């Protein structure tokens, strides 16, 4: 129940040229080989994933990671114009542990269904968090942590249709996005099992129905906005993929392979701040990312229904929610 400057630890390599490593070796210390988890016996403590300064600190850290890694050729804002060199780099997020300094500790909720806000009775204390990859994405949360028991729903308030809904799955779904080469260099495609994805959607629908009983649960496409939030956007190997997810957020999900068309883009709306970032054309060759969908970002349509149906659509855009999807279980506390 206090605020302090966290630090970061990683298994980054001083010789590795991957940019995440080059940033972590400079900014993060090594991973503590002896983690000490202290389970506080018979203790209940309040958590609030939606008011957690750890999220803001991680936001700043990933902003720094990207200011070093994905330097744009052009950066345009309300009040500034920046032109600079923009060399390609090797890009692959590595796990990052977030640690409290001396005189502070990190409370960790061990209740496996805790929704991130309220009292938790299965508390322990740690020095650092587990490994958290700083994956920037929308709609689909990738390469995160799964729920250890059953699907978990997280919302500052489900009754408020303006509050994002973070879904944590208990069984990841594989998504393989590739831009091939030898045409069109900015055309890519994702493959995903329709059977596994349909099963995941059905489980998430049941869990949502638990909060909206008597209602049919519908998955539909985004209702509008920048291309960042109307597609599954994400950085793969330094290139910005925008993937059409109309075939995922669906009431008619096919049981066979699902193919999503993607575009690799150079002009992007920044999440670090309001503005545009222009990068260089895509590198040549086969650009591939086989990622684990472990979560979802959804928004529920407002107003009362007339055909007994709650509608959920993919959202995102504020990457603080990406960090919340992994930091929900943590709090920084002062020893006293």
């Amino acid at each position, epitope marked *: 129940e206090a605020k302090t400057t966290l630090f970061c630890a990683s298994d980054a390599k001083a010789y590795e040229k991957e940019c995440h490593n080059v940033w972590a070796t400079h900014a993060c210390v090594p991973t503590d080989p002896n983690p000490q988890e202290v389970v506080l016996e018979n203790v209940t403590e309040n958590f609030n994933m939606w008011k957690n300064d750890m999220v803001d600190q991680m936001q700043e850290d990933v902003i720094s990671i990207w200011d070093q890694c994905l330097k744009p050729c052009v950066k345009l804002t309300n009040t500034s114009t920046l032109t600079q060199a923009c060399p390609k780099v090797t890009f692959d997020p590595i796990p990052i542990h977030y640690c409290a300094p001396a005189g502070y500790a990190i409370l960790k909720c061990n209740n496996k269904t805790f929704n991130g806000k309220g009292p938790c009775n299965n508390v322990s204390t740690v020095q650092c968090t587990h490994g958290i990859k700083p994956v920037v994405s929308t709609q689909l949360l990738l390469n995160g942590s799964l729920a250890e028991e059953e699907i978990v729903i997280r919302s500052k308030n489900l009754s*408020d249709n303006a509050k994002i809904i973070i879904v944590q799955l208990n069984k990841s779904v594989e998504i393989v996005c590739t831009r091939p080469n030898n045409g069109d260099i900015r055309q890519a495609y994702c493959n995903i099992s329709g059977r596994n994805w349909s099963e995941a959607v059905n489980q998430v629908k049941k869990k949502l129905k638990e909060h909206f009983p008597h209602k049919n649960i519908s998955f539909q496409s985004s*209702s509008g906005g920048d291309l960042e939030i109307t597609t599954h956007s994400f950085n793969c190997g330094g290139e910005f993929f925008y993937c059409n997810t109309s075939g995922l957020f669906n009431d008619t999900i096919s049981n066979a392979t699902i193919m999503l068309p993607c575009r690799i883009k150079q002009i992007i709306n920044m999440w670090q701040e309001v503005g545009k970032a222009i990068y260089a054309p895509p590198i040549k060759g086969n650009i591939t990312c086989k990622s684990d969908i472990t979560g979802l970002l959804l928004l529920r*349509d*407002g107003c009362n229904t007339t055909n007994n149906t709650e509608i959920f659509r993919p959202g995102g855009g*504020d990457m603080r929610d990406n960090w919340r999807s992994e930091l929900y279980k943590y709090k920084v506390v002062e020893i006293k």
Partner: antibody
Amino acid sequence: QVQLVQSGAEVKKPGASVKVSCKASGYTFTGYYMHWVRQAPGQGLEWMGWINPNSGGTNYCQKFQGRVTMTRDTSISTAYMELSRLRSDDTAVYYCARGKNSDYNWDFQHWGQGTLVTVSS
Amino acid sequence: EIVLTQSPATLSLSPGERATLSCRASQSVSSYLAWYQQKPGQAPRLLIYDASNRATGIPARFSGSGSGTDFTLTISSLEPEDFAVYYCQQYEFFGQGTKLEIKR
């Protein structure tokens, strides 16, 4: 001095569309959701949807899904509400509104003057 | 569904008296209720937020209270300009309002 100024009145034939604009001033246009609420002559307030001006994300009242579209132009701090396939029911004063704070955006502390839209053949 | 039932539909009182408008939520909704005033030809004006917090520039004679499903707006010593339509709001849902008329 927060100000929301909307476009002028509109008369439309059924089946047509109408786009109402709402220019904001006195605050960071991208830091607060913008809501649209209509009021038929002699009736109550009806919520239609909100838009997040930062990313353009929208949430539409299920009654209007399909024929309402909300958009924004940040360079001019303006929000747009377009209602298509109009009909006599849509005759109303349309307001843009903004909540008091960023955290809770449903306490509509700021309203436009309203834009009257009349629909009839 | 979620419905806000305001009552009475109309309320006739004299200046100086105290008015009491009720707003019922169809299900428990904690304390996220707002109260608005609306004059003819004007946009709604926020009076109360969070059930009991007076908005900016709202005089002291306005008071909001309640919780769960029953909420109330109280206006002590009615002044001539306090006669208008009063709406309650819960998220995107509005009550159908009560009209406060002058008694003579």
